[PDB]
Enzyme design. Sequence first.
Site, PDB file in Angstrom:
ATOM      1  N   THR A  44       4.325  -6.035   6.291  1.00  0.00           N
ATOM      2  CA  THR A  44       5.425  -5.088   6.162  1.00  0.00           C
ATOM      3  C   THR A  44       4.996  -3.693   6.591  1.00  0.00           C
ATOM      4  OG1 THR A  44       6.570  -6.310   4.414  1.00  0.00           O
ATOM      5  CG2 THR A  44       6.932  -3.930   4.527  1.00  0.00           C
ATOM      6  N   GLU A  51      -5.626  -8.734   9.951  1.00  0.00           N
ATOM      7  CA  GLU A  51      -5.316  -7.306   9.926  1.00  0.00           C
ATOM      8  C   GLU A  51      -5.619  -6.597  11.243  1.00  0.00           C
ATOM      9  OE1 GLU A  51      -7.356  -6.420   6.032  1.00  0.00           O
ATOM     10  OE2 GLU A  51      -5.493  -5.298   5.692  1.00  0.00           O
ATOM     11  N   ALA A  83       0.827  -1.204   0.000  1.00  0.00           N
ATOM     12  CA  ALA A  83       0.000   0.000   0.000  1.00  0.00           C
ATOM     13  C   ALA A  83       0.861   1.255   0.000  1.00  0.00           C
ATOM     14  CB  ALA A  83      -0.940  -0.004   1.208  1.00  0.00           C
ATOM     15  N   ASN A 143      -6.048   4.820  -5.169  1.00  0.00           N
ATOM     16  CA  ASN A 143      -4.814   5.548  -4.896  1.00  0.00           C
ATOM     17  C   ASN A 143      -4.811   6.931  -5.540  1.00  0.00           C
ATOM     18  OD1 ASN A 143      -3.890   3.400  -3.395  1.00  0.00           O
ATOM     19  ND2 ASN A 143      -2.686   2.506  -5.075  1.00  0.00           N
ATOM     20  N   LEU A 183       6.867  20.781   9.059  1.00  0.00           N
ATOM     21  CA  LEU A 183       6.178  19.672   9.714  1.00  0.00           C
ATOM     22  C   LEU A 183       5.814  19.994  11.158  1.00  0.00           C
ATOM     23  CD1 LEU A 183       8.318  16.698   8.342  1.00  0.00           C
ATOM     24  CD2 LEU A 183       6.060  17.447   7.550  1.00  0.00           C
ATOM     25  N   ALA A 222       6.229 -10.583   4.516  1.00  0.00           N
ATOM     26  CA  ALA A 222       5.960 -10.922   5.909  1.00  0.00           C
ATOM     27  C   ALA A 222       4.616 -11.620   6.096  1.00  0.00           C
ATOM     28  CB  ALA A 222       6.030  -9.669   6.780  1.00  0.00           C
ATOM     29  N   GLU A 271       4.634  22.703  12.426  1.00  0.00           N
ATOM     30  CA  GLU A 271       3.375  23.433  12.514  1.00  0.00           C
ATOM     31  C   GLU A 271       2.159  22.521  12.415  1.00  0.00           C
ATOM     32  OE1 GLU A 271       3.586  26.824  10.047  1.00  0.00           O
ATOM     33  OE2 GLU A 271       1.937  27.891  11.045  1.00  0.00           O
TER      34      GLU A 271
HETATM   35  N1  LIG Z   1      -5.761   2.249  -0.398  1.00  0.00           N
HETATM   36  C1  LIG Z   1      -4.907   1.264  -0.671  1.00  0.00           C
HETATM   37  N2  LIG Z   1      -4.830   0.179   0.175  1.00  0.00           N
HETATM   38  C2  LIG Z   1      -3.965  -0.827  -0.089  1.00  0.00           C
HETATM   39  C3  LIG Z   1      -3.151  -0.782  -1.210  1.00  0.00           C
HETATM   40  N3  LIG Z   1      -2.405  -1.907  -1.219  1.00  0.00           N
HETATM   41  C4  LIG Z   1      -2.724  -2.652  -0.138  1.00  0.00           C
HETATM   42  N4  LIG Z   1      -3.700  -2.001   0.564  1.00  0.00           N
HETATM   43  C5  LIG Z   1      -4.325  -2.440   1.819  1.00  0.00           C
HETATM   44  O1  LIG Z   1      -3.310  -2.954   2.649  1.00  0.00           O
HETATM   45  C6  LIG Z   1      -3.775  -4.045   3.416  1.00  0.00           C
HETATM   46  C7  LIG Z   1      -2.750  -5.177   3.373  1.00  0.00           C
HETATM   47  O2  LIG Z   1      -1.445  -4.656   3.520  1.00  0.00           O
HETATM   48  P1  LIG Z   1      -0.353  -4.667   2.330  1.00  0.00           P
HETATM   49  O3  LIG Z   1       0.179  -3.286   2.028  1.00  0.00           O
HETATM   50  O4  LIG Z   1      -0.950  -5.281   1.084  1.00  0.00           O
HETATM   51  O5  LIG Z   1       0.790  -5.639   2.931  1.00  0.00           O
HETATM   52  P2  LIG Z   1       2.371  -5.323   2.848  1.00  0.00           P
HETATM   53  O6  LIG Z   1       2.695  -3.945   3.360  1.00  0.00           O
HETATM   54  O7  LIG Z   1       2.850  -5.480   1.421  1.00  0.00           O
HETATM   55  O8  LIG Z   1       3.068  -6.415   3.818  1.00  0.00           O
HETATM   56  P3  LIG Z   1       3.182  -7.999   3.491  1.00  0.00           P
HETATM   57  O9  LIG Z   1       2.212  -8.786   4.345  1.00  0.00           O
HETATM   58  O10 LIG Z   1       4.583  -8.458   3.814  1.00  0.00           O
HETATM   59  O11 LIG Z   1       2.882  -8.216   2.026  1.00  0.00           O
HETATM   60  C8  LIG Z   1      -5.108  -4.461   2.825  1.00  0.00           C
HETATM   61  O12 LIG Z   1      -6.118  -4.203   3.771  1.00  0.00           O
HETATM   62  C9  LIG Z   1      -5.301  -3.581   1.606  1.00  0.00           C
HETATM   63  O13 LIG Z   1      -6.626  -3.110   1.531  1.00  0.00           O
HETATM   64  C10 LIG Z   1      -3.222   0.307  -2.070  1.00  0.00           C
HETATM   65  O14 LIG Z   1      -2.503   0.362  -3.068  1.00  0.00           O
HETATM   66  N5  LIG Z   1      -4.106   1.332  -1.793  1.00  0.00           N
END
Ligand SMILES: Nc1nc2c(ncn2[C@@H]2O[C@H](COP(=O)(O)OP(=O)(O)OP(=O)(O)O)[C@@H](O)[C@H]2O)c(=O)[nH]1
EC number: 3.6.5.-
Lengths: 438, 425, 352, 54
Positions: A145, A183, A12, A228, A252, A99, A254
């Site tokens: 992660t 999560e 994300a 996004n 930052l 992870a 402020e």
């Molecule tokens: N808004 C938004 N949410 C995202 C995006 N990518 C993942 N998410 C959210 O992130 C959550 C899962 O975390 P990830 O970012 O996919 O996991 P990671 O940081 O890659 O960590 P790992 O478990 O090691 O893969 C989910 O609930 C998704 O909805 C994104 O591009 N945009």
Amino acid sequence: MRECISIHVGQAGVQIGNACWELYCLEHGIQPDGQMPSDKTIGGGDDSFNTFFSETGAGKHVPRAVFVDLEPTVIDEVRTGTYRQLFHPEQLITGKEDAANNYARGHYTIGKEIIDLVLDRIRKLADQCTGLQGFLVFHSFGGGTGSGFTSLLMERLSVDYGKKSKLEFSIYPAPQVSTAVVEPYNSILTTHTTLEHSDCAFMVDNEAIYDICRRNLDIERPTYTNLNRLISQIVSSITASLRFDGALNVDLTEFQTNLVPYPRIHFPLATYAPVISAEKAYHEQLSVAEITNACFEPANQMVKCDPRHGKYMACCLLYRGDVVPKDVNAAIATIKTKRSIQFVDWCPTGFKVGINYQPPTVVPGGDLAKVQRAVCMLSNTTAIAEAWARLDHKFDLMYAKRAFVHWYVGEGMEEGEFSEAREDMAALEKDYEEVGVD
Amino acid sequence: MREIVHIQAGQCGNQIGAKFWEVISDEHGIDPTGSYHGDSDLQLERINVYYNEATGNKYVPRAILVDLEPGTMDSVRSGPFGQIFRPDNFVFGQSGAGNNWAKGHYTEGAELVDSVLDVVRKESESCDCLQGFQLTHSLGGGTGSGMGTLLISKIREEYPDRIMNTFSVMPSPKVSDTVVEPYNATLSVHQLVENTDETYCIDNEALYDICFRTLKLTTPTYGDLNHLVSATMSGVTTCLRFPGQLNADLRKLAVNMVPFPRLHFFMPGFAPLTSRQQYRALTVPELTQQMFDSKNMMAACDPRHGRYLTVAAIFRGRMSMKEVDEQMLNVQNKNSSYFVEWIPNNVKTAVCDIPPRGLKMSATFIGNSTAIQELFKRISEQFTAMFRRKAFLHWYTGEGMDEMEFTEAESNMNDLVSEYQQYQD
Amino acid sequence: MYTFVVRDENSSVYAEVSRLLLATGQWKRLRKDNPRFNLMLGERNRLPFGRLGHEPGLVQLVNYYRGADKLCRKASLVKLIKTSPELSESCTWFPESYVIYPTNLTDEREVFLAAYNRRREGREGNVWIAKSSAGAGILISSEASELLDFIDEQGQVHVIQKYLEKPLLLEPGHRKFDIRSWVLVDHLYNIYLYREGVLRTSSEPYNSANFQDKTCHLTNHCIQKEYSKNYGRYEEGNEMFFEEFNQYLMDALNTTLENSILLQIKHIIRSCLMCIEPAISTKHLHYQSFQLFGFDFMVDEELKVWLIEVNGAPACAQKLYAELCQGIVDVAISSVFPLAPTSIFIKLHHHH
Amino acid sequence: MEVIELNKCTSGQSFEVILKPPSDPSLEEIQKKLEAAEERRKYQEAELLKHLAE
Ligand SMILES: Nc1nc2c(ncn2[C@@H]2O[C@H](COP(=O)(O)OP(=O)(O)OP(=O)(O)O)[C@@H](O)[C@H]2O)c(=O)[nH]1
Ligand SMILES: Nc1ncnc2c1ncn2[C@@H]1O[C@H](COP(=O)(O)OP(=O)(O)CP(=O)(O)O)[C@@H](O)[C@H]1O
Ligand SMILES: Nc1nc2c(ncn2[C@@H]2O[C@H](COP(=O)(O)OP(=O)(O)O)[C@@H](O)[C@H]2O)c(=O)[nH]1
Ligand SMILES: NC(=O)c1ccnc(NC2CC=CC2)c1
Ligand SMILES: [Ca+2]
Ligand SMILES: [Ca+2]
Ligand SMILES: [Ca+2]
Ligand SMILES: [Mg+2]
Ligand SMILES: [Mg+2]
Ligand SMILES: [Mg+2]
């Protein structure tokens, strides 16, 4: 001029960062190759956009950003995408296996073996900053992660950069766009070990961005791309003060000074409008009063909650486009006499307003339509605690049975760090109730 | 690059694994000689997951064929896709296992285990990053059960932090080779409880009843039964083999599906299941309603007799994902009495635009349901029915086993039943 | 197949609604902790509003408006009226009231004594009543010393409001009474008034020279059936319905219940609910709200209607449980979750 | 209703409006928590091998 380093952690974080720097470039007139025609000082200068971009003797404006992911799939897109020429390979850090949505795996197991490398890549950007302000950390709550590695990076940043501020952009987990179930654990784990290390955190609930895309943009099933490009508009409006000439939110520090009177309550609610579908025939341009009045509907809040049943501690109005102070005050008056805006008795009932004349920039071919004026309202309401309550409840439903706990213990984490985190949240929910309820 | 290592053991293990490599090979556009001839790049996206890339753009499956007798593996080599497997990856003995777990796990199989691991290690060392292993095998025979579990016990020792998922055929008295299958089954179950991360439970009776009752086959065959396993194995791997908003490896997949270490036994299901009225277009409601139908599941367990801990569903074809969400949310909100209320959002859905060979659209079901205890109860009943008289034990004591080890396997699975019971209430 | 959960086992109102929903065969009940529900019959106190409206595809509906406590709390209603410009401090239908905190803890103690001393000086009827939400505990007295000394002996928020020394007395009997109006508000904020009200009457003659005996001054259904000796003499259960009451008004005073009382009540219910609409409305909220209200009114000898309090979790008269509960499903529940008249309500139109 | 601190430049302006007045772990400790978890992994993996050894 003072520099700001952006860090992107997890899937994300990396994709949202991609959508942001794409937007920043379109705003500052920076092309994919890094060239900026309007920039007349070549190779240097202390302009406002230089808080996010450095300059090379060849004229390339390079983001002050560091992408970090434990698996290379998502960052590889960045290495071969439209804006591949902006960054250099040092700024892109990839592991080999992620992870597995496991906080313990991203914090302890895998994190321990890549942390010193990430720091060294951040130190390399810091050495270029003549007066570094702080860091902007994008990540997700649910990802192994985004949650596990971020909390570690923050603890170490607070050691190597003590006096520097750290702002978060966190993605609240929403089932509609997630295939994971653990999560809630990660979210409540990462917020426990990061709370003391983050000065101000903006939480975006995917559930909210989702319904904003389905309701305003008529997307039946939205992709991460859609989610996004919208979240990058909000972020663009929250950071514009740091990148453009101005006097409100110029560094930052402020942000905490303006939005966070109490430290632990550093989670401001964000509200944005308008959000108009580009596929639309042609919309009636909303006035200042109309778009401002929208800042109090739950429909365009980054987190779904009810502010009317909380108390405000601060309130910023960032305007972009054809907006003048006279029209701002008129809207404000008309809204107090019609809305339920209860401030805490130990804070002034007022509003800090900033206006940048340049109207919101839109991504060519994107989903959003070009508007003449728009606003983003940051407000610290005790109503956002509803978010934590939702999350803390799920955590309680699983932990009561110890479901999935072995996956975390198995990575070296102790079962006590759950209850310790959970009792920390219960203290956070308690501080929110002490501040807003009678 | 997240590679998987495939292992198939024994008669059942290899005939199932065989057709499996036949089904996904067609989906990935690889011919019986290892040459690609597809029309889409999505076929090669995650191709290195189950295939090694040799010289001349040849794709060699990353599978290891194991057996104690040469018969079955000769069939595969002369089979349709036999020429595609690596000639070295054939590791077989000659004594056979005699449908005896003891021979496969202690005496005969032991003499061949090191050599099988020498090939497993040879495939892993070439994996840029190994995701984990998968084993196809039966539990009622001697090799796939006896030696199969022996291999898993030794793969967890050498690869302790790697995922080991298995497709395990459970024996039913209705589709029975020998009367000792409950013996072999009870023994293997304890190994899987101890060392595997995910075990897809497939009951031959369920496979039989599906071919006889539903598909309308007057006299089914192990070959007919293996078609269902091929199409199912293809399904639960579509996530790993094709792109999409999923992006997850074996460890991430197991994290969101196994809330307790020892309760990693799933009930798979497939849809549609039509008899030859086969050209009728199938709607998204019909697809979903059947997918949750017990008769569309292969564990011979009634899901309404237990409760679901987690549920994964993979939809294949060009359909309305908006319509998929609506329908999946409908089944949950119409039968929320069979899902545990202490795991939020324990039903996930993934879409894949590539349908199986010859189907506009299809669904694959992965249920982590406490109803699976009915399976281990049958096996435990048939085990005690014989062990109480010590019947047929001499085949095992003669290979070096003692009655004490049997009494332990007895109590080992009764515990597995008590565990599944405390979570159904 | 709609689904609902029950979190209030003591609610006699929604105990029948649940019984009716199940009789429809199209509403399935779930355990009180299952979040996958369409309709929630929530608890009274500390209802977790924050967790509603976050289940994909599920449209959720709750039976309590978040923030309605502002109207159903003794000290809250008073503060609402005085501070709300829509109602103003000069409200003519609400008894002159004051919020009083015990001295062991803003507070209108001095403002109360000023208006108290002005009355005592002007020979005007100066009998006040002390009450609080934490009561079944009420004290009526004409001396300011007793009222204040009675609240200090407690420890919760109290309210002192003027006691109506000239209440309308029924005949035969010479007795007091109050009016209960059930007002249902749906998700669209339509204000439906139940065509059927009730009058909880007193079976003891009114005596203005003895506020010590509170059996002829309080009209609660539990006080009359415990401390009153003429319970059930005149009417059944100390409850007269809108048919017998309308006939009495026409025979004695030559007027109708519609013109003499119902108009004012319909005006109070509207003003009270329109006032807080922009604060409790769920028009654009991620979930939807509805709630049944139990307004209590007083009628003086000049046929003027006063507001006593509003009950957020009120009960219904034994004889009207069926008709009212059924209507709740027609306009509040089925209006959102349709199934596969002569409305028993009177819609009070207004500007949203 | 009062407007204070009005700042103006070429790309916009900002001001404040008032409606009503009012009424860490050191680097040593982090390495320990990290290494402590690694020690609990090494021991938990050892118990597995000891089990397989048996
Ligand atoms: N808004 C938004 N949410 C995202 C995006 N990518 C993942 N998410 C959210 O992130 C959550 C899962 O975390 P990830 O970012 O996919 O996991 P990671 O940081 O890659 O960590 P790992 O478990 O090691 O893969 C989910 O609930 C998704 O909805 C994104 O591009 N945009
Ligand atoms: N200002 C006033 N003048 C005259 N009578 C009053 C009064 N305030 C209260 N009462 C009497 O008290 C009774 C209502 O008491 P109150 O409503 O304050 O307590 P309560 O809320 O426990 C009863 P309920 O909730 O059932 O209406 C009425 O029957 C009325 O006769
Ligand atoms: N579905 C299916 N089951 C099989 C097949 N072959 C054997 N079995 C089952 O597996 C058990 C016999 O085990 P077997 O495969 O002969 O073990 P082996 O000694 O390793 O070859 C019996 O219960 C059979 O029902 C097959 O091709 N398909
Ligand atoms: N071995 C598993 O558990 C598995 C494998 C393939 N797909 C799964 N579920 C999908 C549901 C949505 C995305 C993933 C689960
Ligand atoms: Ca420059
Ligand atoms: Ca700090
Ligand atoms: Ca031998
Ligand atoms: Mg990831
Ligand atoms: Mg055989
Ligand atoms: Mg009351």
